[model samples]
Target: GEELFTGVVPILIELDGDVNGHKFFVRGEGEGDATIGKLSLKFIATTGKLPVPWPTLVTTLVQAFSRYPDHMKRHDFFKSAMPEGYVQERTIYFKDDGTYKTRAEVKFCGDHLVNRIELKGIDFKEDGNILGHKLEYNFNSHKVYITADKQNNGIKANFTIRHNVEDGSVQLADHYQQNTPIGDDLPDDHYLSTQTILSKDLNEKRDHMVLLEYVTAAGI
Candidate 1:
């Protein structure tokens, strides 16, 4: 007897507690032939959190979202969206038993509907705060950036209980806002001026779109 099955499996891993590596493989099998594709590893060595059981995080998230349901609009502009004046801020901690048994709150800010996002791992802290020494990003841009102000109580240095590496396994190359052209000198009309300014620096704007394609393939 024989059968066929085809699909892809993506594995997410943490390196030295600071790097996020996403590895994927497509596999298939048929009556007379079978194939197992090579494993591809996408190493994102930055001070980032490895994916946790996000499903487990949903309840706290739900509550957080309820407090700031409109945050979704920041992710997209075309969708029927949150009103322009909504604003929300919340902080919560979940334990091993899927309960919001532990929690804390940092001060809230602004009157212009805003969504404040926080990134933290389960094993990343000893005092129940997020790891300050890790990667934290600005929610508005959806770009990967790390926090430099370690003194901020809300964002402090810590590591996932899993990542014990002193340097953390994640390596951070740089930060970018949405579709920033990889380089400068692009037709100014085609350029996204605002996002580029948000960048940390404008050293040498090389078109990262194409570069990212290959780097993405190579798992850099």
Candidate 2:
């Protein structure tokens, strides 16, 4: 058997630079016992060279989380959303407290971003064993569904993530439901749920020179 746990962490994105060149940095820091881990992301672009729309860039970057557990490989979502020639290398060190240290580097041509992930971990395998797996995301009826499976010592588990575009709510579950229509709405019976307020608000706050104030007030 496997123990299950869930929670939400604050995701912060920072953008800088003038029209000639721009930089975006994002951080996801965990608090309490949710234990989803942390992330540091960065993106760089120029106005005339390698032009990329801010909205599209940011949205795609955030959505790339759908493939996070897969280490950003073999997924249509990640392949199309990630920058051209994107490559990532990660090294994880499992620890006794169940928490682990992950050092990762993401590169897009000449641009590069590095991050370190550390948080309380969960034992999701039986007989104290873990296995590598794949994850897939499906978009239907203005919603997104992501699923992954893990098997070890004759035990198997299904992990799912659901996002409702209408309400901007996201949920992660440890089980799967069958015979459910793609257009049918599913009950919020998952392990974790949270509202996703995109980068639009943050961009607005930045333009008005109150980004720090807004973020501080929002407590994210």
Candidate 3:
């Protein structure tokens, strides 16, 4: 069995069944009763349709948000949708009710390979000047961290920042610059902002990782 500490939940993976469908389990292996959450998946042909629940859908979407590189598409979503200067980070924390938070972690490299920033932070909504609801990220190592502020009112985001060489000589894949804030005219159901990065970039040095694959399991 292999383990991935998302800081919020420890995803224990077991590959079984045929190539079409495999049983995967993501558990909350923190300092609790191991009941944070769980999800199940089965590949339905090549159409990319899995019978996942709504709550699980949210979790699945959030996981997707964690696998993208920082760029205009991502930055604009957060900056315009969320409060200005709202920086995401990689960190972890606990709440008074013993419930974990929802957060996003991101990594990006532009023209320079060394210009990388890793962050995990809480997701919050703004109603005019007032902020509402708090979501956070959780992980053990610096791979990503998700937590909240002391007052628990604001989602405090954190991240690991890296810059390119002084001359910016290095180059990267899928390079894009410039960002525009997500407009307010969009529907409410749409994603105000997503923390997703490239699948290849997210699984940089990991093995047994697949794009958009989610799993769940029964405890021992």
Candidate 4:
């Protein structure tokens, strides 16, 4: 055998976070004649993290909701019927054996399930935001999904990892973005992508509420 090459690279280089679009995907693997030693990984979202103290969307969202005052108020009917608040946040994750687990935390009451009302073609806006065209709406729905417009895509970045022979530590970062030649210029690399399941950028896509599903109550 030539024994030409061996390298210390990550098997799966990826970034996980709640923030959309601002993810670093596994880019490149190491290539050299070095055995991978036990090394730690330092990963982070270069973008801002936290509650992202910006209500820019709230104000905008409020105005948008205003356009559909009647439709918005319709939701009140369901809320008022509720004995108490039924708002909940569901946590979903995967387990080691490739199983999915989910738990819900209700804001007020969880003993009773919400109801669903599917109305077809009401009238408001061409877009789905206004919410009148659909009839599938429920106050007790366990799942809610946001619909995104595809015209405006997201920025997905690729990453590359390096295992420093000297430090024996691994480093990973976007390899194809925001870089200037030491003294020259060249076409940009594959750091930019017009695709993402999640994105933070506004205007990229018109995210609107699209669907609601209620969990049926059955005997254990």
Candidate 5:
């Protein structure tokens, strides 16, 4: 005889040693084929002792909605939503060969999230003057753009994140360089351009699930 069960298993991870504890949940849905068809992660914080700013956390969460814009668009929370007016700053640390960090300060105003990101390293010391200018999220079009200005020592950068309405795949495009006044490009000898894309896809061949576990353990 063969038996089959289709349901969801809830997993919760709670942090210790905090007066205002933080917790995260992972919901795994099992399909008829005995494989996890849908997986979702959620966070809950009861007190105000969270590490990052609320907006920062919210922005990170809504990134998933970018992948499913149709669902987001239909939801009342994200439908024709406008940005709030607030200023918050946070420093994000990256695990690299050495100490690497970036400062992100955001100001939300009228459907736009304006942020200034400054890179921390010896290479960008001379050229990293508030990198990102503005990031606009179009709810109707389901597109996001990060644009920079040339006022910062002629260094301009533009990065875009687009979500396909049909499929849940996301695409990214980035252009960053320091241009000369004569319309020539300077050599990026000491500086190395880098772009890192982090997603929540949980394929066996990918390491995102492992990274997520590590991050959760590290309380990041």
Candidate 6:
């Protein structure tokens, strides 16, 4: 059974017979990450009115549970807390090496719908700077090519760039655009600046920016 990791779960029992006219409680707990984890039976006499010895209480509760194992196996809270697995009736009587243990496991995830990747880069400018393209969308996919409406800004042809948001791969479409600092096609300093800004801006953005979700995988 899968339960995405959790601390021990306590099983509390009220003792009908109490000393000094007081109601007492006995607690059983175990620790484990997986549903198929171990459970060493233990009992704590929380009610101070009775001075019950550790071995005495331990033996009594062990016998009580051993005789009526089905009572705890059919516990409502126990079943509700762990619907994926069932508790074993068997109990291990320890020789005081340790005491108490309860555990559960499995990681959990969020809702399927996710966040919109927030990326702001390539703010193109005038006076030789062009405003960076503004992206506004609510999705997890990015693809397709983009081009300038007008040419001659040194970009003789429509150039496409693919920014792989995953691992920082900015693919300037076409081999001609691939090799940097090439001669001829570029017009002037302004256009040169545009190219310069693009390569760096997109490079860093692609490398550094991304969206992620924390997931905990465990029992379903």
Best by TM-score: 2
> What's the CA error at residue 98 for candidate 1, in Å?
12
Give all TM-scores, in the order shown: 0.18, 0.21, 0.18, 0.16, 0.20, 0.19
Give the alpha-carbon lDDT of every model.
Answer: 0.20, 0.23, 0.21, 0.18, 0.23, 0.21
Clashing pairs in 5: none
Q: Which 10-residue span in candidate 6 carries the lowest summed lDDT?
A: 189-198
Residue 119 of model 2 has an lDDT of 19
Off by over 4 Å in 6: 1-23, 27-30, 33-36, 40-44, 49-51, 59-220
Decreasing TM-score order of the candidates: 2, 5, 6, 3, 1, 4
Backbone clashes (count) for model 1? 27
Q: Residue by residue across 1-220, what tens digits does model 5's lDDT show?
A: 0011124323232221111122222112111111222324433443333322221222222110122222222221111222321122222221111112333322223232333333332221121111111112111121222222335322222323232222343322222222212111111112112222223444333211211110100000
RMSD in Å for all candidates: 21.5, 19.4, 21.1, 27.8, 20.9, 32.7
Pairs with steric clashes in candidate 4? 6-32, 114-140, 116-138, 117-137, 118-135, 118-136, 119-134, 119-135
Q: Give one digit per residue, the lDDT tens place, for model 3 in 127-172.
A: 2110221221111111222232333222322323121222432111
lDDT of model number 2:
0.23
Off by over 4 Å in 3: 1-98, 102-107, 111-207, 213-220
The TM-score of predicted model 2 comes to 0.21
Q: What ordering of candidates by lDDT runs from best to worst?
A: 2, 5, 6, 3, 1, 4
Candidate 4: tens digits of C-alpha lDDT, residues 27-85: 11111111211222222223433111111111100000011122233222112322332
lDDT of 4 at 178: 16
Residue 174 of model 1, lDDT score: 20
* Candidate 6 positional error at 38, Å: 2.8
Write candidate 2's Cα lDDT for 10-37 as tens digits: 3333232221122223342222111332
> Looking at model 4, which ten-residue stretch has the lowest summed lDDT?
56-65
Query: How would you encode candidate 6's per-residue C-alpha lDDT over 80-131 as one tens digit per residue?
Result: 3222322111111222111212211211112111111111112112111011
